[PDB]
Amino acid sequence: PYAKMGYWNPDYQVKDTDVLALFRVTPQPGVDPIEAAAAVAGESSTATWTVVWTDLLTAADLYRAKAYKVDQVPNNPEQYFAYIAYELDLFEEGSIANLTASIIGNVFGFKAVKALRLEDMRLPFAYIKTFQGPATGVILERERLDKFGRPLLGCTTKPKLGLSGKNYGRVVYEALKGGLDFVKDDENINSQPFMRWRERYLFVMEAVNKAAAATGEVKGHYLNVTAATMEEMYARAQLAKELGSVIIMIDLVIGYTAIQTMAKWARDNDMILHLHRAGNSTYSRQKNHGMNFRVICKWMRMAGVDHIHAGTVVGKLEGDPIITRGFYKTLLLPKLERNLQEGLFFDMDWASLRKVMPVASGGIHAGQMHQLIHYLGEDVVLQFGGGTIGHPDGIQSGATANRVALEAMILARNENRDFLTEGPEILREAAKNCGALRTALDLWKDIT
Amino acid sequence: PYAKMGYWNPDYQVKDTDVLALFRVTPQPGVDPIEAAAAVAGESSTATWTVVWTDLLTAADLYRAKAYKVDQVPNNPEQYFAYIAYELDLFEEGSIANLTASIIGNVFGFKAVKALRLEDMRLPFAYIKTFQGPATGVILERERLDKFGRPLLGCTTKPKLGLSGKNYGRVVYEALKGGLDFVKDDENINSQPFMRWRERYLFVMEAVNKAAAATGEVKGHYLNVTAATMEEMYARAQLAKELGSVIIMIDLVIGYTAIQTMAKWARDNDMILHLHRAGNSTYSRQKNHGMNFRVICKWMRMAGVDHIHAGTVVGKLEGDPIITRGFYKTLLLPKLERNLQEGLFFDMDWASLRKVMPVASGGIHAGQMHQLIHYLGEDVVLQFGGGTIGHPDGIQSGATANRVALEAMILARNENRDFLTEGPEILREAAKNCGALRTALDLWKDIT
Amino acid sequence: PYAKMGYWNPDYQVKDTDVLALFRVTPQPGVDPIEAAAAVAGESSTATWTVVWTDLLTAADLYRAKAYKVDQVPNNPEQYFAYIAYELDLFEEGSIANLTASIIGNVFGFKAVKALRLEDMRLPFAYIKTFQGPATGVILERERLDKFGRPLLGCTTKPKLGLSGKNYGRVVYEALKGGLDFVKDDENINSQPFMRWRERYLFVMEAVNKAAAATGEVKGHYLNVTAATMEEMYARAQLAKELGSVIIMIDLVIGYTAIQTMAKWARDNDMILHLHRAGNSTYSRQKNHGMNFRVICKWMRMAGVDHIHAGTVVGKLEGDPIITRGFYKTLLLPKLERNLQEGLFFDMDWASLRKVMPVASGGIHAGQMHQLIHYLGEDVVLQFGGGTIGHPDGIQSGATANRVALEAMILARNENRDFLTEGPEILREAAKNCGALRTALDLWKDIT
Amino acid sequence: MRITQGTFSFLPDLTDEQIKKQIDYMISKKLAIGIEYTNDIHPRNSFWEMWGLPLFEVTDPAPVLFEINACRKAKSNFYIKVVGFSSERGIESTIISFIVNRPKHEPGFNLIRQEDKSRSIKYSIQAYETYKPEDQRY
Amino acid sequence: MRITQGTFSFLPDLTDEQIKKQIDYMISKKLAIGIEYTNDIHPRNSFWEMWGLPLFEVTDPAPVLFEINACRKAKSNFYIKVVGFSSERGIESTIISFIVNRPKHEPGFNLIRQEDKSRSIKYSIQAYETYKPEDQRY
Amino acid sequence: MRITQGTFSFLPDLTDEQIKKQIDYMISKKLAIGIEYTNDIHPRNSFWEMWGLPLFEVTDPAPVLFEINACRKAKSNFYIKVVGFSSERGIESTIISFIVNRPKHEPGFNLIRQEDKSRSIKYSIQAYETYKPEDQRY
């Protein structure tokens, strides 16, 4: 009996310190929306099923979440948006694991709801201020690299697995010297019988410094430090730092406590921390159950990763452009304004936490540069794949073609050409002076 | 073009060393089942979208996952079961994060599938042997507690939050002395402005030792050591060990690297490690997308937790009895036999890894004891809630009523009475000699 | 009464997880072969001489070794080959000391056998997978040295003992600069009144870097880190790492726990680990008692040494060519096939453990290069001795003569000349262009 | 107080009829059956005294009940328990242990608090009867 | 070799028409505009020399182009870049930086490998022209 | 001095007849064949420059010799080597690498000794030609 137990309060006045959650709720065929909403509040706060006298030894109302507004969702009569408020005192300062436990704990397995999806959260300023936020952040990252006014470019080593430490380093060297700012370890390469981790790091740093010497730029390779236990991750992180790497990477599957541990480490060790979002789609993909990816973006900016894969609008993930824009905003703006189409349900001030660099990958090519720039903007790392390594003229050529296209597009944008409309032509003019790019355009024009 | 690229092989012969995954696949309206299957294999192994010559510097076929069988699912024409094999060499020994990355990495966000759910995995013996498995395990746990031949009983402190360290300890003391084997911290209690963690631990151990002295049993309280960073978790773990606690608990949301870190710690420190599965329903609940909970049970037994919440058949989670049985089997047996109704798609030998104790909670009461024993068996921790703390006669009475019912049911089972049929009467006979239990039955007979 | 106590079972079915041993058994004049075999199984497993009731508190059959086949050996009627199986659960993962204790424990001193020799073992895949295997391994070793397609060449410093640290370094410098890839410490040089260890290391690294600078190759000297206690070995190892040595060496007599300790160290410290087999002949030499050297090769590949002395077919150890080949196979192949002439009694998969580099030494000279290549193949370190240091023209000349002969022989092999038949002539053609080599041939033609 | 070690200690003390049905269960489970007794009831006193050797391959509850009763007479003022050991691989341990005799009065346990660093305490528990020699308890 | 620091260095060197349109963009973004020059092209040489003070509140590209050309004449054999500083809160940094003059020949960089523990190396990179005094490079 | 990286560097430089027979061997071994060149002859310079892509599935030494000769003409004063990569599982690496062109004079290496704690030294080796820009060596 949740609506009568205090968990529904359409009168409740939200405070600036309250943590607020927006759930997309699908009640069980018979159950009332308000009862569904109250159940979710109750079940994730003080959800006891008889009366308990021990409640009265505490200020019981403070520890109750409050469902304070329900709306039916625009186009689907069987779904409601439920707004719930939690007192700031319920949470451990600086702890993602506590925030997560507290918010998404029980309620996804509860029966009186068919389906349930956390869509957005308002983290109050005073809570946000207890987190470190990005170890490095976009601004310092660009000052470290001395690279300004353009996206950065990367790609993952292909084949993902199998090359020896020396053959692996070859690909790194070719890609960086050809024009890429970064190359990376695949999320699956950690330390395996075909290649242990130390020789990979050692060959890689020779590749990276060789390419700096060849181009006159700061270059880097995300060394993946992902490992089974924290001490093992620290050993890997420590070697990357010892060899002078500008950047390491971690997989999201190491989980939140290890990520905040590493984020502190990267802050204290002047290291860029790239988060690979491997596994995220198991709960962020279906529209009716789980957690929306924007809530992950919030938590990860708080925790303090420097880059996170955020979506491409075009390619192997042609997702909604307006929703993706919402992700990039969360990652990059000082303040969020509520905008229902973007899926941002609350205003939110980021309390001067640093920005995270979004990363676009997944079947992208130089032939899309004008849409990429148009949709994703300037602060993004565009990650190519077979786009680079399988250029007929070689890895260096693959890299150069991407870099020439990128720069020509930004130059055009800054000239105020209508680059979205004129983009294919802008590419063609650049390719006039660049064979590697002509070959790439010819090769990937009909890409379906 | 995955089926033509080598990723579909109905002839492939599975080896004893291969890691095998069973995915429930929902192809996009137009796409062929075999093409869907091959796409999932390809996209999670060597999934490059042009030709790359660097593949030829490696034994390329070894690093390709192989889709080797597809079947349409029994009652739903639009779904297929896809069987995929991965070479043992693709994985880091003893690493859950690597296994996870590798298996569930990209493929959940892929477009040519509408929906995708990992249902089971065959972990080969040689891989399983590189993991520690449960720090303690059922057998040693019972030798440590000197408690044999019956489920163990626990409950979570109510109110979950708000009591002072001294008022908190009161509830622990009453519950343990009344007959519960364990009391626990809620997954949400870590260290908060209303109560910091150290005074909780210190009051709790006085409660626990007082109750040992009152009953003549080894008692325990799961102290929650969940914290934002690993060093902070270690500090908490260390205090619990210093004060002589028999048991601590961790929330699953700390993530897999922190859990394997703690599992090693618990093995080396003679500590029972309870895993609280908070958050799991966001991906294990919907039948068409995400990961089935049995695959989590496999990974967590490998990683080495000692208890994990595994389901109640009756109560606030009346889930399928035959599927739940499958979970308990995974957790407890030396060997698994394929049984499609249970949702166990592969035989699997556990390579003498220790057993994990399943935990049932969620709206259970003494009035169900006969179904609980019948469904869940003897190796389980039955966790009560308002079942205990809100007994009209007091916390001690709540505890005693549960313990009397439990023991009377096991006694009946061992007498070979038809306890499932005769259970309500068996309860009534026990209540004749036990007022606390009569009060509980009267109070929770119509529980809907 | 072992055959009746369960220790003989010709029906037993061997499992893929079982550890299997092959013993060469010489029964006491009266005792039956089957009784001998069963006695060896019994005496090394659960070998109690009255009845014990405490057995029945365990799954007793699991802990019994089983003699499951006996054959009389081909040419010696008084000897039998006994095959014994042990359950994988009897052994500690990753422990050579436990494997050794368990297998060779009591049974060599037992009376009902006159003589007993362990000849081979089948280590099951799942057990092998719990060992690190070679710190470096042949493949990475060659990538570190950038030396491919040919044996590597070394020699031990002569005199073995007595030179000052500065006079010692002289020999190292001359040998490396003349063409040797490595020079080494004798197994007897550790730290002695005539020369303490630190000045040796310090002079040696100046020699080694001088020679790199003179030749343009990565060079190394095996610094012997052998010492009385583990902390003392670590101090020595640490200095070699600090000075940037590519390689250290250990004597087999430090024993198995210290060797696995160092093997881990070398893996974590990017160091090649050479094992010197000093003392091995006391149990591997006689054909009727002790342990065959191939079983040592198995254990040492598991433990994780990078080089091990494995035999020369010609010279001061003209041992059987077909048996030696068996040793090299164990060391170098991914998989072993049973071949009775080689003395490999079981198929065995190495579970992708790295390869160990065999080392041939003992009275070899350039005049044998064609047999050396023919018998020992390409992955081997050919260690010269007085072959190098006592060239009439000087140490550099001694080294060059060896290197020229080696390369000319490999060049010939790759031309598909019949180098075994044509070898002396191939040497003569090379010596036409190389005085140092002509002098060596003249000098060591009648070597008896 | 009532000591609640044992599988059925929250029930009334078992009748001999009840015990006999628990032996039946043990037998059907193929357990070795041990009878053990003690007068230091500390919960960490892992090694009670053995009343003879465990009985293996038992096929009738009679011999077991006879020893239980023989133990009760000789040790009437000791706790006595029956223990069933499973030899099933992967278990190889106790799977049931219940009390079949209690002394007539249990005084319980002293709780000792040794004050250690800051606010921590090192606890011991000591059964009151063990402040007396064995031959004088209960 | 061609040094590829700068936002448009993979393009052909900009014409003055092109530069002028980049100044327009900077102006529309309300940037301070700085002209800086150097003949140690090391990528970690964070502080190139300043050609006068940044220009603030510029409203016409002319004065900027004039200084760029004045810098090119005085420093024709130095690299020269134009830098746009944003004072927007939370940015307060460079948001664009591109090369507007290169010396006629770039010899590139020496790579130095100092061998350290085990297999590790400590690297330096040193531009060849910096083996010469400033007044003699390029 | 004569740099002795390479499988046959202690032999006289190979004739084209000799090279051709080494390609035959590589082919019979099913190797990918790469031609790589460099003018920093440091032994830890792991990544020489690539002359086009490795050649796979070669069945006749001719195309390989043609590229070798094309590389020699374009890069006559660089070291050039031929490399054979095995894709055999468990090897997946280089199995042969030999020099097919040397510059006309090799001056060799400077040895640098940086004095560190007590008596230890940190060494570098630096090829003399790398004190010059790439386009001026040898």
Mind giving me the DSSP string for C188-213? T-SSBTTB-HHHHHHHHHHHHHHHHH
CB neighbour class for A214 (10 Å; exposed up to 12, middle 13-18, buried from 19): buried
Please answer yes or no on whether E116 and C271 come within 8 Å at the CB atom.
Answer: no
Q: How far apart are the C-alpha atoms of C384 and C368, rounded to whole Å?
A: 12
Question: Do A226 and B253 touch, CB atoms closer than 8 A?
Answer: no
Domain boundary among A105, A131, A157: A131
Strand order in the sheet with E121-127: E121-127, E109-115, F121-127, F109-115
- Write out the H or E segment, with its range, that includes residue C219: none
One domain, residues C176 and C235: yes
Helices within A116-196 (DSSP H only): 125-128, 137-145, 165-178
Say whether residue C242 is in contact with chain E using an 8 A CB cutoff: yes
Residue found by looking up tokens 């893996």 in the block: C267
| Token pair of A126 as six digits | 């005073």
Q: How far apart are the C-alpha atoms of C381 and C395, rounded to whole Å?
A: 19
Question: Do B197 and B191 touch, CB atoms closer than 8 A?
Answer: yes
CA distances from B324 to A131, B328, B335, B359, B375 (A): 40, 6, 17, 12, 9
Q: How far apart are the C-alpha atoms of B162 and A59, rounded to whole Å?
A: 7
Q: How far apart are the C-alpha atoms of A142 and A11, rounded to whole Å?
A: 47
Q: Which of B245, B269, B277 is nearest to B176 (CA)?
A: B245
| Residue B276 annotated among the catalytic residues of the structure | yes
Task: Tell me how long chain A is.
Answer: 448
Domain span at residue C26 reads: 5-131
State which amino acid sits at residue A336: L
Q: Which of B446, B437, B447 is nearest to B391 (CA)?
A: B437
Domain boundary among C115, C131, C147: C131
Domain boundary among A78, A108, A131: A131
Q: Within 10 A of B208 (CB to CB), how many other CB atoms are there?
A: 27
Domain boundaries, chain D: 1-138
Pairing mode of beta strands A307-309, A335-336: unpaired
Half-sphere exposure of C117 (CA within 13 A, CB side): 21
Cis omega before residue C159 (within 30°)?
yes
One domain, residues C370 and C390: yes
Which residues are F122's β-sheet partners? Answer: F114
Q: How far apart are the C-alpha atoms of B207 and B175, rounded to whole Å?
A: 10
Read out DSSP for B396-431? HHHHHHHHHHHHHHHHHHHTT--HHHHHHHHHHHHT
Q: Within 10 A of C15 (CB to CB), how many other CB atoms are there?
A: 11
Question: Do D56 and D64 touch, CB atoms closer than 8 A?
Answer: no
**Facing B216 at nearest CB: one of D4, D46, D119:** D4
Question: Do B16 and B115 touch, CB atoms closer than 8 A?
Answer: no
Chain D neighbors (3+ CB pairs < 8 Å) = B, C
CA distances from B331 to A331, B271, B278, B297, B328 (A): 40, 19, 18, 6, 5
One domain, residues C82 and C194: no
Q: Which DSSP state fits B318?
A: -
Method: X-ray
Q: Which of A345, A364, A350 is nearest to A294 (CA)?
A: A345
CA distance E6 to chain F (A): 22
Based on its alpha-carbon atoms, the radius of gyration of chain C, rounded to whole angstroms, reads 24
Say whether residue C436 is in contact with chain F using an 8 A CB cutoff: no
Question: Do A253 and A222 touch, CB atoms closer than 8 A?
Answer: no
CA distances from C426 to C401, C418, C438, D76, F10 (A): 14, 10, 12, 98, 15
Q: Which residues of A participate in the annotated binding site for substrate?
A: 106, 156, 160, 277, 309, 361
F78-F80-F86 Cα angle (round to 5): 155
CA distances from C3 to C113, C138, D7, D114, F40 (A): 15, 45, 43, 59, 72
Catalytic residue among C219, C221, C276, C329: C276
Q: Which CATH number do you get for residue C261? A: 3.20.20.110
Read out DSSP for B125-178? HHHHTTS---SSHHHHHHHHHT--SS-EEEEB-SSSS---HHHHHHHHHHHHHH
Interface E:F, Cβ pairs < 8 A:
33
One domain, residues A271 and A141: yes
Question: Do A390 and A158 touch, CB atoms closer than 8 A?
Answer: yes
Please answer yes or no on whether A54 and B255 come within 8 Å at the CB atom.
Answer: no
CA distance A422 to chain F (A): 35
Pairing mode of beta strands C182-184, C113-122: unpaired
Task: Tell me how long chain B is.
Answer: 448
Helices within B224-278 (DSSP H only): 230-243, 256-269
One domain, residues C210 and C245: yes
One domain, residues B310 and B189: yes
Question: Do D23 and D112 touch, CB atoms closer than 8 A?
Answer: no
Say whether residue A366 is in contact with chain E using an 8 A CB cutoff: no
Question: Chain F residue with minimal CA distance to E128?
Answer: F133
Which residues are D81's β-sheet partners? Answer: D36, D99
Q: How far apart are the C-alpha atoms of B116 and C113, rounded to whole Å?
A: 64
Question: Chain C residue with minimal CA distance to B125?
Answer: C126
Q: Within 10 A of B105 (CB to CB), how many other CB atoms are there?
A: 24
Q: Which of F96, F28, F83 is nearest to F55 (CA)?
A: F83
| Residue C276 annotated among the catalytic residues of the structure | yes
Q: How far apart are the C-alpha atoms of D66 and D35, rounded to whole Å?
A: 11
One domain, residues A168 and A105: no
Q: Which DSSP state fits A135?
A: S
| Token pair of C285 as six digits | 């030499």
- Write out the H or E segment, with its range, that includes residue C365: none
Question: Do D95 and D31 touch, CB atoms closer than 8 A?
Answer: yes
Task: Tell me how long chain E is.
Answer: 138
Residue found by looking up tokens 């990179």 in the block: E125
Residue found by looking up tokens 């630190």 in the block: C198
**C186 marked ligand binding residue:** yes
> How far is residue F36 CA from its own chain's centroid?
6
Pairing mode of beta strands A335-336, A182-184: unpaired
CATH architecture of the domain E1-138 equals 2-Layer Sandwich (3.30)
The phi, psi pair for A220, rounded to 5°, reads: -160, 165
Residues whose CB is less than 8 angstroms from the CB of residue B1 and which lie 6 or more positions away in sequence, other chains included: none
One domain, residues A136 and A63: no
State which amino acid sits at residue B291: M
Residues whose CB is less than 8 angstroms from the CB of residue B11 and which lie 6 or more positions away in sequence, other chains included: B68
One domain, residues A37 and A151: no
**Facing A394 at nearest CB: one of F46, F47, F53:** F53
Which residues are B224's β-sheet partners? Answer: B249
Q: Which CATH number do you get for residue B126? A: 3.30.70.150
Question: Do E91 and A190 touch, CB atoms closer than 8 A?
Answer: no
Q: How far apart are the C-alpha atoms of A174 and A395, rounded to whole Å?
A: 6
Q: How far apart are the C-alpha atoms of C276 and C252, rounded to whole Å?
A: 6
Pairing mode of beta strands A247-251, A357-360: unpaired
CB neighbour class for B37 (10 Å; exposed up to 12, middle 13-18, buried from 19): buried
State which amino acid sits at residue C431: A
Domain count, chain A: 2
Residues whose CB is less than 8 angstroms from the CB of residue E135 and which lie 6 or more positions away in sequence, other chains included: none
CA distance B400 to chain C (A): 34
Q: How far apart are the C-alpha atoms of C360 and A370, rounded to whole Å?
A: 64
Question: Do F56 and B56 touch, CB atoms closer than 8 A?
Answer: yes
- Per residue, the 3-state secondary structure of B117-137, as one string, reads EEEEEECCHHHHCCCCCCCCH
Residue found by looking up tokens 């190359």 in the block: A183
One domain, residues B50 and B64: yes
Q: How far apart are the C-alpha atoms of C266 and C303, rounded to whole Å?
A: 12
One domain, residues A183 and A285: yes
Please answer yes or no on whether C214 and F5 come within 8 Å at the CB atom.
Answer: no
Residue found by looking up tokens 């895949």 in the block: C125
The phi, psi pair for B195, rounded to 5°, reads: -170, 115
Helix A197-215 vs helix C137-145: crossing angle, to nearest 10: 20
CA distance A235 to chain C (A): 10
Q: Within 10 A of F118 (CB to CB), how many other CB atoms are there?
A: 7
| Contacts by C423-431, CB closer than 8 A, 24 or more apart | C423/C369, C423/C370, C423/C371, C423/C374, C424/C370, C426/C370, C427/C366, C427/C367, C427/C369, C427/C370, C430/C404, C430/C405, C430/F11, C431/C404
One domain, residues B254 and B381: yes
- Per residue, the 3-state secondary structure of C248-295, as one string, reads EEEEHHHCHHHHHHHHHHHHHHCCEEEEECCCCHHHHCCCCCEECHHH
Which residues are B349's β-sheet partners? Answer: B335
Question: Chain F residue with minimal CA distance to C335?
Answer: F90
Question: Chain E residue with minimal CA distance to F128?
Answer: E110
Residues whose CB is less than 8 angstroms from the CB of residue F54 and which lie 6 or more positions away in sequence, other chains included: B53, B56, B57, F32, F33, F34, F83, F85
Q: How far apart are the C-alpha atoms of B135 and A277, rounded to whole Å?
A: 30
**C309 marked ligand binding residue:** yes
Q: How far apart are the C-alpha atoms of D3 and B217, rounded to whole Å?
A: 8
